[PDB]
Design a protein around this motif. Sequence first.
Motif, PDB file in Angstrom:
ATOM      1  N   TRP A   8       0.844  -1.223  -0.181  1.00  0.00           N
ATOM      2  CA  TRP A   8       0.014  -0.059   0.313  1.00  0.00           C
ATOM      3  C   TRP A   8       0.461   1.212  -0.208  1.00  0.00           C
ATOM      4  N   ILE A   9       1.848   1.436   0.963  1.00  0.00           N
ATOM      5  CA  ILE A   9       2.735   2.593   1.008  1.00  0.00           C
ATOM      6  C   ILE A   9       3.696   1.964  -0.177  1.00  0.00           C
ATOM      7  N   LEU A  10       5.057   0.817   0.413  1.00  0.00           N
ATOM      8  CA  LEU A  10       5.222   0.104   0.189  1.00  0.00           C
ATOM      9  C   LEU A  10       4.518  -0.887   1.510  1.00  0.00           C
ATOM     10  N   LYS A  11       5.157  -1.020   2.357  1.00  0.00           N
ATOM     11  CA  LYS A  11       3.937  -0.100   3.507  1.00  0.00           C
ATOM     12  C   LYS A  11       4.699   0.777   4.062  1.00  0.00           C
ATOM     13  N   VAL A  12       5.558   2.123   3.595  1.00  0.00           N
ATOM     14  CA  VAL A  12       6.648   1.087   3.119  1.00  0.00           C
ATOM     15  C   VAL A  12       7.600   0.522   4.025  1.00  0.00           C
ATOM     16  N   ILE A  13       7.107   0.933   5.845  1.00  0.00           N
ATOM     17  CA  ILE A  13       8.304   0.416   6.931  1.00  0.00           C
ATOM     18  C   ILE A  13       8.698  -0.651   7.200  1.00  0.00           C
ATOM     19  N   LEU A  14       8.150  -1.683   6.364  1.00  0.00           N
ATOM     20  CA  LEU A  14       8.597  -3.011   6.383  1.00  0.00           C
ATOM     21  C   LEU A  14      10.225  -3.613   5.471  1.00  0.00           C
TER      22      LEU A  14
END
Length: 18
Positions: A8-14
């Motif tokens: 979705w963002i990528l997570k990006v956080i992941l």
Amino acid sequence: HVFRLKKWILKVILQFGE
């Protein structure tokens, strides 16, 4: 479903989460 946090963002956080 809250496991969309994959795609979705990528997570990006992941990508930054190690």
